[PDB]
Chains A and B, each alone.
Chain A
Amino acid sequence: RRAAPLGPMPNEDIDVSDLERLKKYRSFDRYRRRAEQEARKPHWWRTYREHFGEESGPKDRVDIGLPPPKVSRTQQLLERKQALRELRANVEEERAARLQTARIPLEAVRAEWERTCGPYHKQRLAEYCGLYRDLFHGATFVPRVPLHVAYAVGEDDLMPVYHGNEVTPTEAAQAPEVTYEADEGSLWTLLLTNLDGHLLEPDAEYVHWLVTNIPGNRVTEGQETCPYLPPFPARGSGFHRFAFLLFKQDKRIDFSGDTRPSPCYQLAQRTFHTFDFYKKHQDAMTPAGLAFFQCRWDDS
C-alpha cells in the first residue's frame, strides 16, 4: 500500500539519465553548504525544527520603533565606491597586507558599528536574553539611540555596562552616569528595571532607578522618581538581568501614580510591569535606547 507524496520529493528535480553531464560536489565543503541550505527550508514532513521548540517559529512583530533613519542610497554607494578606490590603490596597504602586518583601529570600528549595524545587533542580543518577552511582552523596539551606562568603581576606574556583560553588585552600590546625544528641544525618560528576582510575584519586576523629564543630556536636571537602589540578588539564584530603557516624550509629562517616597526602602513599594507603565504613557512615549547587564550574588 503506497500513499501519494505531498508536493516536492527532495531529489525529484535532478535528471538521472546521463549522470556524467551533471556537475558534482567536488568539495566536502560545498556539500556542507547545500546541506544547511536545505535544513533551513520548511519541509512538509516531520523535521528537527518542528519538535524542538523554535520559539514559536514565525511571529508577526509588533514593532514599536523610533522610525528608520532616512538616507539616499546612491550617495552612500558612490561615496563607498570612492572610499574603496582611494583605500585599495595605495601601495602602503598592499605591501603591508602581503607581509601579514596590519591592524584594524578598534575605536573607529566601534564608531561605525554604532552608526550603522550595531542598532540591529542590539535587537537580537536583547532577543537572546529575552529583554522583549518580559517587558513589552510581544513587541520589538529597534535600539536607534546609543546608550552609555557606567559605574564608577574608583577615582580613575570606570566600569562600562554593555548589553550582555557581567557586573558585580559592588560596582552597582553607587549611582551610574549616562551618555547619549540630543540638542535641547529634547524630552526624555530613562528606566532601570530588574527583570527577574521578584520574590512574591514571578511576572513582576523591581524598578530600581527611574528618571523623568530630561532635556538633552542633562541627567541631574531631570526629575527623579525612584532614587537609586543597588541590585539585591539572592545568594542562591544566579545571574539576574538588568535593563536600561530610554523613551522620547513629546510634551512634558507628570504622573503622580508613579511617584515614590524619597528614601523608599520597602520592596513592595517597588513592583512593576513595563507593560502597564507603557500602557499609561503610550501615546507620548516612544522606546529608544537599550543597555542591559547580568549580575549574580556578591558579598555586599
Chain B
Amino acid sequence: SPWRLLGALCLQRPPLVTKPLTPLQEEMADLLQQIEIERSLYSDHELRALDEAQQLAKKKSDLAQDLEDMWEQKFLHFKLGARLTEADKKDDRTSLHRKLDRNLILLVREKLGDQDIWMLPQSDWQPGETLRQTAERTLATLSENNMEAKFLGNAPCGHYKFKFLGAKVFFFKALLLTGDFSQAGKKGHHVWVSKEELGDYLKPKYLAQVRRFLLDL
C-alpha cells in the first residue's frame, strides 16, 4: 500500500470593496433610513437651523445654510477612487488587483510529460514534512513572491484520492495578507479567479469538489 503524498492549497484573496445591494435590500434600506430619521430627537444643526430661522424673522418684523454650502462644495471637491479596477481592464484574469468585491483564488497551468495538468496549487509533501510546512514552502516557492499568508489552523480543509498505488490530495486554507509578486510576466501561467471563474476553469473532479468547500459570499 504505497501512498504518494500530495498537499494542495486553496488560496484566499480577501474582498476589498463592499458589494452593491439587491433591489429588495435597497427598498429595506430606504425604509430603515426613513424610520431612523423619524425616531431621531432634535439635532444641533437642526436646533440651530430652526430656532435661528424663526428668531431672525422675529428680529426683522420687530448659519445652517452656510454650513450646507461649505459641505456641498467640499464634498464636490473630493474625487474618489473608482470601484471597478477590473472590468476596465476586462481582460486580465491573471491580475491580483482584479476583483475588489469578491474573494479570489490562485490557479496555474502545467503540462507534464505524460499528463496535461491544470493545477489549483499542488504540493508534493514528504512524509517527514508536516502538511503545514509543505503547503507554506511550495506556496512561497512556486509563485516566486513575498507573501504574508495568515493560515487559520493546523487543520486541513479537504482531502481527495486519485488511486492507481494510492495517492492523496490534501487541501488547506491560506488567507493572504500582503502579496509581493516578483516578475508578474514570468512564464508560469497563473490565474486570479472568482467563484464564477473557478467553476469554469477547473477541469478535474478533485478540484470540482474543491469548489464545494469554497466560500460563496
Direct contact of A and B (CB under 8 A): no
